[PDB]
Amino acid sequence: DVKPFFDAARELAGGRLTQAQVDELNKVVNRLVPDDVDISDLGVDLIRQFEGLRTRAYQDSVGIWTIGYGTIRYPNGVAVKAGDVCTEEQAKSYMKHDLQKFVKAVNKLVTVPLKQTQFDALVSLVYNIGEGAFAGSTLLKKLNSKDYAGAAAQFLVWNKGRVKGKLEVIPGLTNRRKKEKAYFEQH
Amino acid sequence: MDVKPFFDAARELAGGRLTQAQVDELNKVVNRLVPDDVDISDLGVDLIRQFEGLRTRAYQDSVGIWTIGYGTIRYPNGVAVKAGDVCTEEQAKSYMKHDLQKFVKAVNKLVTVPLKQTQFDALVSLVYNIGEGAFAGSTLLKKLNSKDYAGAAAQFLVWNKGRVKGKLEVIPGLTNRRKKEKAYFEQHHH
Amino acid sequence: MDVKPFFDAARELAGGRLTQAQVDELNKVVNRLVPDDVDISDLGVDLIRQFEGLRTRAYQDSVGIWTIGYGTIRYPNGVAVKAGDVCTEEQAKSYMKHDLQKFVKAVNKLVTVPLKQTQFDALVSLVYNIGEGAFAGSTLLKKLNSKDYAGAAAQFLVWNKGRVKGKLEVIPGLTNRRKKEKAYFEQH
Amino acid sequence: MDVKPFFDAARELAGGRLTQAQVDELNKVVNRLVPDDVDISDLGVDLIRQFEGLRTRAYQDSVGIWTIGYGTIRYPNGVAVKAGDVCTEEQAKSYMKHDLQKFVKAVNKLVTVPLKQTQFDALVSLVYNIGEGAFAGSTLLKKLNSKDYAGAAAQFLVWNKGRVKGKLEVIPGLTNRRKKEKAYFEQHH
């Protein structure tokens, strides 16, 4: 029931809403679901499958204590330390919390509307390439246009990573972008 | 105004609370809902009218153009003042308010910082007296859009010259006009 | 208007996030930084004066009360009008502007939706003529406070009646007045 | 706290300046925006530590709950203490400091007058022992928020009772603890 919201908005606007203002309100109503637009548990499943589950805390390559699916700090802010243990279900919940920076980034940077499956796939990509890369990205140019084609094709462009100091195609990244692109394309 | 009912309604849609991003989104739409352009007030028309002679019968000004009221040449419906026309004071106020819309539009476009109504009215009075090009090139507008409101106020007083024969000079009464407009502009209350 | 720099600065002061109570506090203070000011316009006063006679010396109205100007029975200083009083038209207009302040307040209070200045003007005229009590209970006001501005405009014309020997009937002139007020309410 | 961007943003909204009344209402919002934020000091933790023995091996308390350190039953990461757990004195201090964070928050939220660090530390020691609810409804807090510091100090001494055979009775151990907390609260120089 958006009638109270629309009436409260009429007050702010002077009594009536223009057609453009109705369109801007309608965009806001989509963001007013409880806790805002978030990655779904299926989107978390999409992401976890590309990583290893560790039930015991361990030190990553740069020395940082890590648990679960790459978690270094628990939802309450406390750092993972030696001797920590987690279940699969805890590891999923920790990863969901670690994705919140990237959920927020997709919501902010994407100005056109999105289906939940498009959103989940975009969170997977941005988790893996970073906020800055996504923000500066030709993909975000084409997507902010309701072009769910040049954006979905731009997934496959992000299959490079560093080997011996240069970028080269990483087979695992090629597979992951194909799965993400297929997710973003679901009906 | 307080947007409380807007946020209350949004809060209930969002399950009892708003996240920081939801608050930011609501603030963007508030910006786009709240009307942003403004008109000169009747107290602003009085500020300008004060210094003008009122004519209730149409007359020819120095270049032959039929005029009525407080310098009106064309009515709101676009019809030129003609010989034999008559007006009341109330009509003359209404005609000059329409005459002023040129300068209301210019102050709205050219000023990029928020204005109180009293500030807006005093600027329209100045622009009416000096015109859009002088205003737009002014140090007044530069200091104002830089949020130096008090610096902008002081610049009212430099616009006290008018043409006499082939030159400009400080006019008897123009300093006093600018002073009154500066005082209006710097009102702290009501 | 633009509240984003205010909320950005408030968020950073609060430690990087705002609670629900803090958001509501910020909204409350913005309304004190930019408060709404609503008064009858000069044309709205004219709209009402249209219908009244100017009296430059006090007379008794139909119920015996001494009146002067455009219907003034108490001066801005609180003194009641009395026999022998005289006034200029400028004084009369000043008294009448003060007379309408009570109704500027009442329209602002009973109406909970925004109003264009022309809408506000026409409503003060109506409420001055019919009184707050009739206004409060009116179908007009319920539609208006529902943001049904078109519906409220058409309700003007039902207020063309008054009391003769103890019940309602149409008063000559009130139909024309309500028609003029409706037009006024509906300008663009 | 740097309130200048907030005032400057408020000035902008208001047409370039603030009236005296607007400054006064903006200052009230600032009070609501800035957290009281005091933390217990290391010396305050020592005050609370001293009432308990350090236990380096997990043990079951008097109601069966596995416990370690200075009365810790749940680690900072949220994991319950379990049988076989061991800790160092430094870890046990850490767990205590996390255990106190709920009560640090409560003292900050409930006290609305300025507090010396030593005053704050002693209040956290009391509230940890008596709980947030008892402190919230106390005469101590009402005298304290009235700027009656000396009266609040005296109110420490009335919190020396605990349950004995189902009713409240004075417990000398609590009397001695309240005396030390009051002495700590009244420090200066």
Tab-separated table of C-alpha atoms in Angstrom, chain B residues 1-4 7-8 11 16-21 23-24 27 30-31 34-36 42 46 89-90 93-94, chain C residues 1-4 7-8 11 16-20 23-24 27-28 30-31 34 36 40-43 46 49 93:
chain	number	residue	atom	x	y	z
B	1	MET	CA	7.126	21.656	5.909
B	2	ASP	CA	8.769	19.062	8.110
B	3	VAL	CA	9.037	15.917	5.955
B	4	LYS	CA	8.145	13.752	8.972
B	7	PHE	CA	9.627	9.588	6.403
B	8	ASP	CA	6.941	7.995	8.586
B	11	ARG	CA	9.537	3.775	7.422
B	16	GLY	CA	9.890	-0.138	10.773
B	17	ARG	CA	13.288	1.460	10.087
B	18	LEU	CA	15.244	3.095	7.265
B	19	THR	CA	18.829	2.178	6.369
B	20	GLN	CA	21.352	4.963	5.653
B	21	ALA	CA	20.977	4.400	1.898
B	23	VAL	CA	17.477	7.818	4.012
B	24	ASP	CA	19.783	9.148	1.285
B	27	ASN	CA	16.503	12.932	0.582
B	30	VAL	CA	12.708	15.432	-1.310
B	31	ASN	CA	15.110	17.695	-3.254
B	34	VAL	CA	10.059	20.638	-2.860
B	35	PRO	CA	9.323	23.590	-5.187
B	36	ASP	CA	12.518	25.514	-5.822
B	42	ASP	CA	3.827	41.753	-2.056
B	46	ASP	CA	5.991	47.605	-1.844
B	89	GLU	CA	-3.684	51.415	-7.589
B	90	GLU	CA	-4.487	47.733	-7.129
B	93	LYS	CA	0.522	46.940	-8.372
B	94	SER	CA	-0.617	43.885	-10.341
C	1	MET	CA	16.135	22.862	-1.662
C	2	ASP	CA	19.061	20.488	-0.988
C	3	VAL	CA	19.364	18.652	2.341
C	4	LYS	CA	22.220	16.354	1.314
C	7	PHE	CA	22.696	15.036	6.250
C	8	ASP	CA	26.236	14.197	5.098
C	11	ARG	CA	26.095	11.477	9.509
C	16	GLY	CA	29.131	7.442	10.200
C	17	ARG	CA	25.513	6.359	10.539
C	18	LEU	CA	22.262	7.907	11.739
C	19	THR	CA	19.689	6.293	13.999
C	20	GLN	CA	15.963	6.630	13.352
C	23	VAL	CA	17.055	11.277	11.330
C	24	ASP	CA	13.788	12.562	12.815
C	27	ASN	CA	14.104	16.678	9.776
C	28	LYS	CA	12.625	18.666	12.652
C	30	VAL	CA	15.422	21.658	8.867
C	31	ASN	CA	11.849	22.855	9.209
C	34	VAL	CA	13.408	26.937	6.427
C	36	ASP	CA	6.768	28.058	5.984
C	40	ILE	CA	-3.178	36.633	2.781
C	41	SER	CA	-1.954	38.398	-0.357
C	42	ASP	CA	-2.836	41.938	-1.398
C	43	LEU	CA	-5.155	40.613	-4.096
C	46	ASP	CA	-8.960	43.040	-2.443
C	49	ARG	CA	-12.934	44.143	0.122
C	93	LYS	CA	-7.608	49.028	5.180
